Amino acid sequence: GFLKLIEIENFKSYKGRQIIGPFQRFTAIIGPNGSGKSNLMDAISFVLGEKTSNLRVKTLRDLIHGAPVGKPAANRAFVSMVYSEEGAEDRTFARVIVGGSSEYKINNKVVQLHEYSEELEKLGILIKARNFLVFQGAVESIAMKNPKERTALFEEISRSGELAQEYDKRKKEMGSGSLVPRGSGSAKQAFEQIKKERFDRFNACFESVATNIDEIYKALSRNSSAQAFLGPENPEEPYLDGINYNCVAPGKRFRPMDNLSGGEKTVAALALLFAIHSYKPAPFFVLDQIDAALDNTNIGKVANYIKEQSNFQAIVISLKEEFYTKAESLIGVYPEQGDCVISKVLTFDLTKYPDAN
Amino acid sequence: GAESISLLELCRNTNRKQAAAKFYSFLVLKKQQAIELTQEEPYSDIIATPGPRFHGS
């Protein structure tokens, strides 16, 4: 399915009730500095289950418009997502601030966070892995992360991490931690069996991503000389050590990885993001200023990949006309004068105009 | 000058990059309070009228 629109009421700078969108398959959010783009990113994170600590406030009630200056505009606020799927009625997922705590709703019926998260997971929206959302200043870190932290992402998406506690227990019961481990019989077999279960879960995900990433890095790079390799440091127990990620940039000789430019790291990060999607598809990606370090050549290749894929919807926030003029529609954010920053939006269809001369 | 400016009229016979730049300029002018903006429905025309601050050109 796809994200048809977002409805926001009195959330941070978005005073009153506002429709954001409707979205097309490739939509860009744009606007002058200070207009409220980052607050809109926060609203999307919020309705998709983000914890209050990651929303730049000390308490949930501070997300209500006007609260950071002692003048809250209401005793409630909400963000809602309308999710659409062919052959199905629209489904509305909402997070409402009432009484200083979150209330979750699906089609206006109240659900607990566990059920909200479970229903989002059935759509491909993983609110723990959060592989569908890239924040400003973060895209490069995806390609340059610690190998061990890359493993943790795969343990979360594959659910192999659900077995780590039993794995650790059986490993010690088998003698790990003794000077000379003496494993034999049932304790050793118990460990081998949970090791196999964790291995199988991990590799069901990892092998799929690792065997699809090269084509995607090529398809992004639009060049058969680019190469991408994903490999475990520990082939027998991939979940125990790091996941190595190395690339060869299109038409370039091999460089380590940290020696890549910001733009080259960005493309490597996107390749990994989209390779994960090839295994566990998300309905949409929200990409906040991922074009910051891209030159114009790479902006064109990234936009072309999105447009010749939109199996997913792309919602991007961009400061670069070279990128956002390749979207189907624009959501423009502007500020209104008031006691505090008020944000409002406009919508503009670019497909009405020739992209030519 | 006129009482109002239609963004869709301004963008007639423009290409995509030119149209996007006119849309972005409306956002900047609104931030500067050089114009007021109305849009009746999502994706309808966007109409500018004079704002409460003077502005050149």
Tab-separated table of C-alpha atoms in Angstrom:
chain	number	residue	atom	x	y	z
A	1	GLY	CA	0.000	0.000	0.000
A	2	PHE	CA	0.991	3.630	0.376
A	3	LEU	CA	0.665	6.710	2.556
A	4	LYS	CA	-2.233	8.677	1.071
A	5	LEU	CA	-2.097	11.631	3.438
A	6	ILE	CA	-1.199	12.803	6.911
A	7	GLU	CA	-3.585	14.751	9.115
A	8	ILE	CA	-2.025	16.826	11.869
A	9	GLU	CA	-3.699	18.804	14.652
A	10	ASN	CA	-1.841	21.190	16.979
A	11	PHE	CA	1.422	19.235	16.797
A	12	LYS	CA	4.547	21.380	17.369
A	13	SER	CA	4.349	24.287	14.886
A	14	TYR	CA	1.401	22.769	12.950
A	15	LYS	CA	-1.322	24.807	14.614
A	16	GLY	CA	-4.918	23.785	13.949
A	17	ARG	CA	-5.978	20.806	11.842
A	18	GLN	CA	-4.107	20.433	8.558
A	19	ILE	CA	-4.047	17.920	5.700
A	20	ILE	CA	-0.492	17.120	4.574
A	21	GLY	CA	-0.689	15.903	1.002
A	22	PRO	CA	-2.227	13.933	-0.565
A	23	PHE	CA	1.050	12.319	-1.500
A	24	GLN	CA	2.019	11.049	-4.922
A	25	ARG	CA	4.448	8.180	-5.474
A	26	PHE	CA	7.372	10.667	-5.292
A	27	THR	CA	6.653	13.818	-3.237
A	28	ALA	CA	9.113	16.417	-1.954
A	29	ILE	CA	8.627	18.597	1.117
A	30	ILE	CA	10.348	21.965	0.645
A	31	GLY	CA	10.432	25.394	2.216
A	32	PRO	CA	12.597	28.186	3.573
A	33	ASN	CA	14.725	27.681	6.648
A	34	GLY	CA	12.722	27.824	9.865
A	35	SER	CA	9.390	27.061	8.206
A	36	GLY	CA	8.731	23.790	10.044
A	37	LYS	CA	10.066	20.990	7.817
A	38	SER	CA	11.867	19.260	10.690
A	39	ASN	CA	8.682	19.426	12.773
A	40	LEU	CA	6.848	17.617	9.979
A	41	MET	CA	9.529	14.928	10.058
A	42	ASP	CA	8.886	14.679	13.811
A	43	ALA	CA	5.142	14.298	13.215
A	44	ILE	CA	5.705	11.388	10.841
A	45	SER	CA	8.066	9.747	13.326
A	46	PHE	CA	5.498	10.348	16.077
A	47	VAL	CA	2.571	8.654	14.336
A	48	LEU	CA	4.925	5.772	13.458
A	49	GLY	CA	5.652	5.156	17.125
A	50	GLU	CA	8.758	7.220	17.898
A	51	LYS	CA	9.581	7.573	21.579
A	52	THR	CA	9.121	11.028	23.079
A	53	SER	CA	12.853	11.271	23.894
A	54	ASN	CA	13.685	11.351	20.171
A	55	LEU	CA	11.223	14.195	19.463
A	56	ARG	CA	13.246	17.023	21.068
A	57	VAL	CA	10.991	17.495	24.127
A	58	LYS	CA	11.222	16.663	27.832
A	59	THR	CA	7.558	15.641	28.146
A	60	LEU	CA	4.816	14.528	25.775
A	61	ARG	CA	2.579	17.547	26.472
A	62	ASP	CA	5.319	19.816	25.102
A	63	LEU	CA	4.478	18.503	21.616
A	64	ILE	CA	1.152	20.362	21.724
A	65	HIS	CA	1.341	23.634	19.782
A	66	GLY	CA	2.224	26.558	22.054
A	67	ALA	CA	3.328	24.416	25.004
A	68	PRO	CA	7.054	25.416	24.816
A	69	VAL	CA	6.014	28.989	25.710
A	70	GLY	CA	3.493	28.231	28.441
A	71	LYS	CA	0.572	28.831	26.042
A	72	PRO	CA	-0.649	25.433	24.803
A	73	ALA	CA	-3.283	25.814	22.108
A	74	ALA	CA	-5.350	22.803	23.261
A	75	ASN	CA	-5.460	19.940	25.729
A	76	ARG	CA	-4.907	17.479	22.902
A	77	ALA	CA	-3.073	17.060	19.627
A	78	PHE	CA	-2.775	14.278	17.107
A	79	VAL	CA	-1.046	12.985	14.025
A	80	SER	CA	-2.800	10.523	11.764
A	81	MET	CA	-1.759	8.521	8.721
A	82	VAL	CA	-4.227	7.355	6.077
A	83	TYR	CA	-2.871	4.101	4.618
A	84	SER	CA	-4.275	2.978	1.267
A	85	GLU	CA	-4.129	-0.380	-0.490
A	86	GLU	CA	-5.667	-1.505	-3.775
A	87	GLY	CA	-8.895	-3.400	-3.179
A	88	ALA	CA	-9.085	-2.254	0.456
A	89	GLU	CA	-10.740	0.587	2.320
A	90	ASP	CA	-8.454	3.271	3.724
A	91	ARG	CA	-7.073	2.492	7.182
A	92	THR	CA	-6.316	5.375	9.530
A	93	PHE	CA	-3.510	5.049	12.113
A	94	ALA	CA	-3.534	7.817	14.703
A	95	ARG	CA	-1.580	8.795	17.783
A	96	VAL	CA	-3.401	11.269	20.032
A	97	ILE	CA	-2.013	13.216	22.987
A	98	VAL	CA	-4.656	13.135	25.741
A	99	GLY	CA	-4.006	13.664	29.431
A	100	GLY	CA	-0.308	13.976	28.755
A	101	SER	CA	-0.087	10.386	27.434
A	102	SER	CA	-0.384	8.720	24.026
A	103	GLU	CA	-3.594	7.097	22.811
A	104	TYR	CA	-3.300	4.902	19.702
A	105	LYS	CA	-6.177	4.360	17.269
A	106	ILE	CA	-6.827	2.326	14.128
A	107	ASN	CA	-9.937	3.484	12.242
A	108	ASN	CA	-10.892	5.538	15.313
A	109	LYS	CA	-10.896	2.427	17.550
A	110	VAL	CA	-8.511	2.647	20.505
A	111	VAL	CA	-5.719	0.054	20.564
A	112	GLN	CA	-2.741	-0.509	22.782
A	113	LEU	CA	0.774	0.214	21.565
A	114	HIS	CA	1.464	-3.512	21.160
A	115	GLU	CA	-1.430	-3.942	18.723
A	116	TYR	CA	-0.631	-0.682	16.912
A	117	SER	CA	2.943	-1.873	16.378
A	118	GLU	CA	1.795	-5.334	15.311
A	119	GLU	CA	-0.608	-3.944	12.702
A	120	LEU	CA	2.051	-1.619	11.298
A	121	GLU	CA	4.425	-4.589	11.027
A	122	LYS	CA	1.962	-6.462	8.812
A	123	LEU	CA	2.238	-3.543	6.357
A	124	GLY	CA	6.038	-3.593	6.333
A	125	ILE	CA	6.402	-0.707	8.802
A	126	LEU	CA	8.805	-1.835	11.541
A	127	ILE	CA	8.694	0.688	14.340
A	128	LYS	CA	11.686	-0.876	16.102
A	129	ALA	CA	13.964	-1.376	13.086
A	130	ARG	CA	12.759	1.933	11.584
A	131	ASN	CA	14.419	1.012	8.293
A	132	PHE	CA	11.908	3.215	6.386
A	133	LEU	CA	13.028	6.562	7.840
A	134	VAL	CA	16.327	8.400	7.302
A	135	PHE	CA	16.868	11.546	9.371
A	136	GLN	CA	18.817	14.654	8.401
A	137	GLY	CA	22.548	14.210	8.843
A	138	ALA	CA	22.232	10.427	9.191
A	139	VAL	CA	22.338	8.862	5.724
A	140	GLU	CA	26.137	8.573	5.601
A	141	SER	CA	26.333	6.881	9.016
A	142	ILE	CA	24.339	3.961	7.560
A	143	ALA	CA	27.222	3.105	5.216
A	144	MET	CA	29.923	3.910	7.804
A	145	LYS	CA	28.365	2.307	10.891
A	146	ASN	CA	30.250	-0.065	13.135
A	147	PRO	CA	30.136	-3.611	11.669
A	148	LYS	CA	28.720	-4.818	15.017
A	149	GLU	CA	25.897	-2.272	14.888
A	150	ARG	CA	25.063	-3.452	11.383
A	151	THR	CA	24.653	-6.955	12.791
A	152	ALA	CA	22.174	-5.636	15.362
A	153	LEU	CA	19.988	-4.205	12.592
A	154	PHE	CA	19.887	-7.598	10.891
A	155	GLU	CA	19.122	-9.382	14.183
A	156	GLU	CA	16.180	-7.020	14.718
A	157	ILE	CA	14.723	-7.314	11.202
A	158	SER	CA	15.293	-11.081	10.948
A	159	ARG	CA	14.060	-11.691	14.533
A	160	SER	CA	17.186	-13.781	15.183
A	161	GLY	CA	17.804	-11.407	18.085
A	162	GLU	CA	14.783	-12.900	19.848
A	163	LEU	CA	16.905	-16.047	20.322
A	164	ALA	CA	20.051	-14.382	21.694
A	165	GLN	CA	19.053	-14.719	25.352
A	166	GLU	CA	18.420	-18.473	25.060
A	167	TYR	CA	21.583	-18.775	22.956
A	168	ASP	CA	23.662	-17.073	25.655
A	169	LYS	CA	22.158	-19.246	28.402
A	170	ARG	CA	22.774	-22.539	26.576
A	171	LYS	CA	26.306	-21.470	25.620
A	172	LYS	CA	27.249	-20.970	29.279
A	173	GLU	CA	25.457	-24.163	30.346
A	174	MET	CA	27.617	-26.008	27.804
A	175	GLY	CA	30.807	-24.736	29.475
A	176	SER	CA	31.577	-21.400	27.817
A	177	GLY	CA	33.354	-19.374	30.472
A	178	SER	CA	35.291	-22.299	31.890
A	179	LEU	CA	39.060	-22.523	31.466
A	180	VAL	CA	38.704	-25.698	29.392
A	181	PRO	CA	35.106	-25.941	28.150
A	182	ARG	CA	33.931	-29.551	28.264
A	183	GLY	CA	30.697	-29.731	26.289
A	184	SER	CA	29.149	-33.125	25.672
A	185	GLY	CA	25.795	-34.800	25.355
A	186	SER	CA	22.599	-32.873	25.906
A	187	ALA	CA	24.003	-29.492	26.980
A	188	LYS	CA	26.188	-29.326	23.873
A	189	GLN	CA	23.363	-30.462	21.611
A	190	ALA	CA	21.045	-27.897	23.227
A	191	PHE	CA	23.496	-25.143	22.324
A	192	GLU	CA	24.035	-26.419	18.765
A	193	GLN	CA	20.273	-26.502	18.278
A	194	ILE	CA	19.646	-22.895	19.363
A	195	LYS	CA	22.755	-21.830	17.433
A	196	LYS	CA	21.196	-23.395	14.331
A	197	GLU	CA	17.838	-21.687	14.956
A	198	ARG	CA	19.518	-18.294	15.319
A	199	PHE	CA	21.738	-18.920	12.283
A	200	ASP	CA	18.760	-19.916	10.117
A	201	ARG	CA	16.677	-16.886	11.160
A	202	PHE	CA	19.576	-14.491	10.620
A	203	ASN	CA	20.560	-15.843	7.234
A	204	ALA	CA	17.003	-15.986	5.882
A	205	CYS	CA	17.193	-12.195	5.965
A	206	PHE	CA	20.908	-11.504	5.533
A	207	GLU	CA	21.571	-13.788	2.558
A	208	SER	CA	18.661	-12.215	0.672
A	209	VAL	CA	19.936	-8.687	1.331
A	210	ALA	CA	23.558	-9.578	0.577
A	211	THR	CA	22.674	-11.241	-2.739
A	212	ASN	CA	20.494	-8.320	-3.879
A	213	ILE	CA	22.676	-5.401	-2.797
A	214	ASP	CA	25.164	-5.500	-5.689
A	215	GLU	CA	22.517	-5.080	-8.395
A	216	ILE	CA	20.903	-2.262	-6.417
A	217	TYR	CA	24.218	-0.443	-5.932
A	218	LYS	CA	24.787	-0.906	-9.684
A	219	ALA	CA	21.204	0.160	-10.471
A	220	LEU	CA	21.665	3.207	-8.263
A	221	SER	CA	25.089	3.890	-9.801
A	222	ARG	CA	23.641	3.065	-13.242
A	223	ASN	CA	27.018	1.454	-13.942
A	224	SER	CA	28.170	-2.173	-14.084
A	225	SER	CA	31.649	-1.294	-12.765
A	226	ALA	CA	30.267	-0.444	-9.324
A	227	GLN	CA	30.335	-3.348	-6.871
A	228	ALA	CA	28.885	-3.845	-3.384
A	229	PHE	CA	29.807	-6.637	-0.966
A	230	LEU	CA	28.095	-7.565	2.303
A	231	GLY	CA	29.847	-10.214	4.350
A	232	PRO	CA	29.965	-11.530	7.911
A	233	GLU	CA	33.192	-11.330	9.872
A	234	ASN	CA	32.158	-14.686	11.398
A	235	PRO	CA	30.712	-16.914	8.636
A	236	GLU	CA	29.819	-19.779	10.985
A	237	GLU	CA	27.970	-17.502	13.449
A	238	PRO	CA	27.229	-14.286	11.529
A	239	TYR	CA	25.123	-12.818	14.370
A	240	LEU	CA	28.091	-12.947	16.789
A	241	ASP	CA	30.417	-10.457	15.085
A	242	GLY	CA	30.260	-7.625	12.569
A	243	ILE	CA	28.778	-7.353	9.096
A	244	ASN	CA	31.371	-5.906	6.700
A	245	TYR	CA	30.160	-3.563	3.949
A	246	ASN	CA	32.582	-2.659	1.163
A	247	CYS	CA	31.926	-1.036	-2.196
A	248	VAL	CA	33.742	-0.121	-5.393
A	249	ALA	CA	32.417	3.171	-6.727
A	250	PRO	CA	31.274	3.272	-10.381
A	251	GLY	CA	34.203	3.760	-12.737
A	252	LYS	CA	36.615	4.083	-9.804
A	253	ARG	CA	39.407	2.058	-8.274
A	254	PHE	CA	38.804	0.514	-4.873
A	255	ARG	CA	39.084	2.777	-1.821
A	256	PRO	CA	38.579	1.492	1.771
A	257	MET	CA	35.237	3.072	2.784
A	258	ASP	CA	35.868	6.055	5.045
A	259	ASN	CA	37.912	7.521	2.168
A	260	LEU	CA	34.727	7.818	0.116
A	261	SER	CA	33.185	11.234	-0.372
A	262	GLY	CA	30.009	12.149	1.464
A	263	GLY	CA	28.142	11.612	-1.789
A	264	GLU	CA	29.647	8.185	-2.397
A	265	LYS	CA	28.883	7.127	1.182
A	266	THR	CA	25.334	8.369	0.674
A	267	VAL	CA	24.825	6.145	-2.367
A	268	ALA	CA	26.301	3.151	-0.498
A	269	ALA	CA	23.892	3.823	2.377
A	270	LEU	CA	20.915	4.032	0.021
A	271	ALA	CA	21.941	0.750	-1.591
A	272	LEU	CA	21.808	-0.961	1.797
A	273	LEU	CA	18.496	0.712	2.646
A	274	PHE	CA	16.925	-0.496	-0.594
A	275	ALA	CA	18.507	-3.950	-0.319
A	276	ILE	CA	16.782	-4.407	3.042
A	277	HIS	CA	13.539	-3.351	1.314
A	278	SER	CA	14.089	-6.056	-1.328
A	279	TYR	CA	13.789	-8.653	1.468
A	280	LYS	CA	11.151	-6.962	3.668
A	281	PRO	CA	9.383	-4.298	1.594
A	282	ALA	CA	8.286	-1.118	3.278
A	283	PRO	CA	5.331	0.752	1.760
A	284	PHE	CA	7.148	4.093	1.837
A	285	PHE	CA	10.451	5.715	2.705
A	286	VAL	CA	10.766	9.088	4.406
A	287	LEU	CA	14.123	10.603	3.434
A	288	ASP	CA	15.153	13.820	5.198
A	289	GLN	CA	17.807	15.754	3.240
A	290	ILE	CA	19.552	12.643	1.955
A	291	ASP	CA	20.701	14.718	-1.031
A	292	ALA	CA	22.854	16.997	1.175
A	293	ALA	CA	26.201	15.532	0.051
A	294	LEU	CA	25.152	14.386	-3.433
A	295	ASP	CA	26.446	16.149	-6.502
A	296	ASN	CA	24.101	16.712	-9.415
A	297	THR	CA	25.062	13.482	-11.209
A	298	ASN	CA	24.232	11.369	-8.160
A	299	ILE	CA	21.053	13.358	-7.474
A	300	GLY	CA	19.847	12.399	-10.937
A	301	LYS	CA	20.699	8.742	-10.447
A	302	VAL	CA	18.974	8.586	-7.058
A	303	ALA	CA	15.873	10.355	-8.374
A	304	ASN	CA	15.769	8.060	-11.428
A	305	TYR	CA	15.980	4.999	-9.190
A	306	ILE	CA	13.046	6.272	-7.118
A	307	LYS	CA	10.954	7.121	-10.182
A	308	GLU	CA	11.668	3.798	-11.910
A	309	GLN	CA	10.708	2.056	-8.636
A	310	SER	CA	7.638	4.112	-7.648
A	311	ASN	CA	7.641	-1.028	-5.329
A	312	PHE	CA	7.798	1.849	-2.831
A	313	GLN	CA	6.662	5.401	-2.292
A	314	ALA	CA	9.214	8.131	-1.569
A	315	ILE	CA	8.570	11.156	0.645
A	316	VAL	CA	11.642	13.368	0.700
A	317	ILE	CA	12.566	16.606	2.424
A	318	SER	CA	14.988	18.535	0.237
A	319	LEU	CA	16.775	21.884	0.084
A	320	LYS	CA	18.092	21.214	-3.453
A	321	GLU	CA	15.974	22.084	-6.481
A	322	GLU	CA	18.020	19.638	-8.562
A	323	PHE	CA	16.415	16.877	-6.457
A	324	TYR	CA	12.967	18.191	-5.623
A	325	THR	CA	12.175	19.287	-9.184
A	326	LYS	CA	12.313	15.559	-10.070
A	327	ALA	CA	9.348	14.773	-7.755
A	328	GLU	CA	5.743	14.519	-8.955
A	329	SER	CA	4.447	16.992	-6.424
A	330	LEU	CA	5.722	19.462	-3.872
A	331	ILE	CA	4.467	20.124	-0.376
A	332	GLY	CA	5.694	23.627	0.484
A	333	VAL	CA	5.954	24.661	4.117
A	334	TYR	CA	5.766	28.299	5.151
A	335	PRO	CA	5.667	30.120	8.496
A	336	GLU	CA	2.917	32.328	9.853
A	337	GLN	CA	3.659	35.062	12.359
A	338	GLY	CA	2.433	34.495	15.892
A	339	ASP	CA	3.378	34.052	19.524
A	340	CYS	CA	5.362	31.006	18.386
A	341	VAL	CA	6.233	29.556	15.002
A	342	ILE	CA	3.134	28.473	13.086
A	343	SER	CA	3.650	26.212	10.063
A	344	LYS	CA	1.213	25.747	7.175
A	345	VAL	CA	1.519	23.948	3.848
A	346	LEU	CA	0.717	24.320	0.167
A	347	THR	CA	0.581	21.648	-2.522
A	348	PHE	CA	1.869	21.939	-6.092
A	349	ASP	CA	1.687	19.457	-8.980
A	350	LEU	CA	4.846	19.426	-11.088
A	351	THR	CA	3.632	16.830	-13.606
A	352	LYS	CA	1.614	19.543	-15.405
A	353	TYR	CA	4.820	21.080	-16.779
A	354	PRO	CA	7.292	19.659	-19.300
A	355	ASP	CA	10.638	18.701	-17.794
A	356	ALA	CA	12.358	19.912	-20.939
A	357	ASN	CA	13.055	22.920	-23.182
B	1	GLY	CA	-0.474	46.264	-10.246
B	2	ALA	CA	-3.206	43.713	-9.638
B	3	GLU	CA	-5.252	42.800	-6.570
B	4	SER	CA	-4.140	39.175	-6.710
B	5	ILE	CA	-1.641	36.946	-8.493
B	6	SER	CA	-2.475	33.371	-9.561
B	7	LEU	CA	0.467	30.981	-9.261
B	8	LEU	CA	-0.997	28.698	-11.924
B	9	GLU	CA	-1.312	31.661	-14.283
B	10	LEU	CA	2.318	32.642	-13.594
B	11	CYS	CA	3.397	29.087	-14.422
B	12	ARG	CA	1.556	28.832	-17.741
B	13	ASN	CA	4.069	27.948	-20.464
B	14	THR	CA	6.898	27.387	-17.954
B	15	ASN	CA	8.915	24.227	-17.579
B	16	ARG	CA	9.051	22.128	-14.426
B	17	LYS	CA	12.139	23.793	-12.933
B	18	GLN	CA	10.770	27.279	-13.598
B	19	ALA	CA	7.376	26.399	-12.111
B	20	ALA	CA	8.964	24.910	-8.989
B	21	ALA	CA	11.028	28.082	-8.553
B	22	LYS	CA	7.920	30.264	-8.713
B	23	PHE	CA	6.228	28.034	-6.117
B	24	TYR	CA	9.267	28.267	-3.850
B	25	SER	CA	9.366	32.062	-4.274
B	26	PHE	CA	5.775	32.251	-2.969
B	27	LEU	CA	6.921	30.446	0.172
B	28	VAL	CA	9.801	32.890	0.646
B	29	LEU	CA	7.611	35.936	0.020
B	30	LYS	CA	5.092	34.614	2.555
B	31	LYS	CA	7.851	34.113	5.139
B	32	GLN	CA	8.893	37.724	4.465
B	33	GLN	CA	5.228	38.806	4.866
B	34	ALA	CA	5.390	40.396	1.416
B	35	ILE	CA	2.248	38.437	0.426
B	36	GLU	CA	-0.700	36.606	1.879
B	37	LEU	CA	-1.465	33.169	0.401
B	38	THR	CA	-4.679	31.210	-0.047
B	39	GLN	CA	-5.210	27.726	-1.441
B	40	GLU	CA	-8.833	26.551	-1.535
B	41	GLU	CA	-8.139	22.786	-1.712
B	42	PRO	CA	-4.965	20.705	-1.920
B	43	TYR	CA	-3.589	21.086	-5.466
B	44	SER	CA	-5.891	23.992	-6.283
B	45	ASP	CA	-4.568	27.316	-7.524
B	46	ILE	CA	-2.513	29.347	-5.043
B	47	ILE	CA	-3.457	33.029	-4.922
B	48	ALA	CA	-1.190	35.769	-3.579
B	49	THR	CA	-2.392	39.158	-2.344
B	50	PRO	CA	-0.306	41.968	-0.838
B	51	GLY	CA	1.120	41.194	2.589
B	52	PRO	CA	1.538	43.494	5.606
B	53	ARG	CA	5.196	44.306	4.853
B	54	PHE	CA	6.394	46.284	1.872
B	55	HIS	CA	8.697	44.493	-0.567
B	56	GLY	CA	10.675	45.527	-3.620
B	57	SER	CA	9.924	44.334	-7.155
